[model samples]
Target chain A: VGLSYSQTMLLKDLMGGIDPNAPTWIDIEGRFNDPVEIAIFQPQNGQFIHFYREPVDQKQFKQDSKYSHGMDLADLFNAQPGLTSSVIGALPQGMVLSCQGSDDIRKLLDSQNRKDIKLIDVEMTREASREYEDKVWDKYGWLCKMHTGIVRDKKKKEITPHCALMDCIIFESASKARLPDLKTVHNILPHDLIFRGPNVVTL
Target chain B: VGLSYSQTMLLKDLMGGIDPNAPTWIDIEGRFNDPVEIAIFQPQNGQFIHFYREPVDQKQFKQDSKYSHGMDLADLFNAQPGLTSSVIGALPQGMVLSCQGSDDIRKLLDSQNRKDIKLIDVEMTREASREYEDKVWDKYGWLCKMHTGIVRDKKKKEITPHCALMDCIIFESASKARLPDLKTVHNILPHDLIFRGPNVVTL
Candidate 1:
């Protein structure tokens, strides 16, 4: 499970044509008994934009921060799946592809199609102990949905109209970016993204 | 730490002219403090003929497996000089230059300028910490040597010149169709090479 030049190209294409005001999603559920992570990288200048933490849950993860932190997109993509890193001290000038709503990210990048950013995902597979079945991680297994709307709280519902649409970028890769600063219903339910904090996992 | 396209081109040129049977002396000692590792690769017919790994253990090196394992010339370079994986994995196909080796590598390749086998050394650099070092685990970082010769027992005056060098393949990268057998060690080390094993590391 490594990122190749073509794969880097695919990621860049996905990010290059994304609309900043749109919300895009890439589902990475059930691919691995563990979890899958994706990194969006730029080819123009080898850097990372954001990372997607697969199966956004903190309880089930096997925690070892050393391999789970921010890393060079090349390292994560090129190593075996299930292999993870934490705290990439210095990323190649990229961001994390968090399950965290895309709006916050929109703020980070002025607009989409800016540079040649790539999407690299790392999937982990664990043996089916008596409790689990043999699982397999997908190679870009999930689809990312691109939407146009700010995540708003129902209580403050008078926000704006949303675009329920999906579009493809330059490489026939389907994805969309989200509008920025759309507040979400904090502590209400179904948070935009769920992730395990650093202190939570021990193993 | 990354190999530019121009460097890859130089590698191709060096590998294009090599002699499989020429004598190869791989150094095994160099203390490196930097965060990266470097290696020289030689290719043939889209493969390699000779893979020289310098001895890393000056004290333990013995050409015979009874005492130690064979090494690659590149391994010697990385031992102490703190080399990087400049050209271990997959690379852009049309890169103009790989700049595979250093002044020493260039000197060696130049000294043996013959149309037999080839040599390609890719210079690379990554952080020294576990976080930045990918090969520290099952990914990168190794000092391996590969050569064909008799094991000399200086004290007994006996030499095991033909012990069918046990699996001289250092890393999977060096164990390909290019240098399939131990007999054609020199010419087989360099050929139509591809940083083929683009194994993805968790980004």
Candidate 2:
């Protein structure tokens, strides 16, 4: 007895909607006009801050080693986000979502008039700072602005350490909270339907 | 280097090396303990098998539902056969596995331990078997148990109806291949390590 076309359509549309005060969604009707890339730099305990963005031009990507050096853009993006999460880009008709990270790559979506770039939290850490044993893996570090200034003292010798949670401070700069509780993590990362790759640029 | 270890030693003993598997490793001060209570049972789909080895003490279990429940036991040995392929309990824990058909509920881990069960899958057949343009929801039909054994003729009626892979078939039968693949899943189902309780009866 509960049947209404408008109500049913509204129910379906409500699923996976955006968070309040978040950026608008981007609907790209075409394909990637450029290359997608991921670039990582600065290593502390082995892990570095890597970026995943779309480039504005394939030709420009060919000239930059940081963006195109033997990197398989398809492989990284397709699986880097883990089993439960991955970035999906439905681009210029034939372009399928693939991997590539870099500011140049981020520009591609931006040039296509894409505006809402969705960010997925892969729980990856940055390469600098006081790292737990888990940090010994990354080789590059981003000097994220949110530096907790936490350090380790060995024989009274002190050195600054890097942490991902603190790095979150660097990104949003607005988060007054500590690390987000994992069990409640479903809401922290929002899926933007209107993402255009160029809206946010990497260093 | 990441490192972890396990050891056993006596606080009062001033000169004793830690035994890796103390109690039984070498039996240094070998002592005798006898007749501990333990049992094993195996179950398969379509076959009405008891999920427990210890004859359930219904009277004792009646006082408190915990003792007589096979769901608790099913949770216990469902995977003792982890090394080999077992239809019922040999797989990993936390599996959404269950049994199917007319004896569906009787084959499920939790519901099997329960009495006064209802067969919902069998209850819904008429609406699906018959096409009444005006009938919205029929009391006689449910779309579960995709494995339908009904035979109908569209010329005469609605020909033999078979269950789809999307609907019925219980866990063990539908998930035969998938059962073994969970062997590599990290953090298995929770197992109760406690042995004593108020309602516990003789083994």
Best by lDDT: 1
Candidate 2 local lDDT, B11-42, one digit each (tens)? 11101111211211000000011101111111
- Each candidate's root-mean-square deviation in Å? 19.0, 20.4
TM-score of 1: 0.25
Fnat, model 2, is 0.00
What TM-score number comes out for model 2? Answer: 0.26
> DockQ, per-model, please?
0.08, 0.04
lDDT at A189 for candidate 2? 18
Candidate 2 docks with a DockQ of 0.04
Candidate 1 lDDT score at position B82: 6
Worst 10 residues of 1 chain A by lDDT: A163-172
Tens-digit per-residue lDDT, A88-156, candidate 2:
222122222212222433455456454454332222233322232223212112122222233334454
Question: Which parts of model 1 are misplaced by more than 4 Å?
Answer: A1-203, B1-203
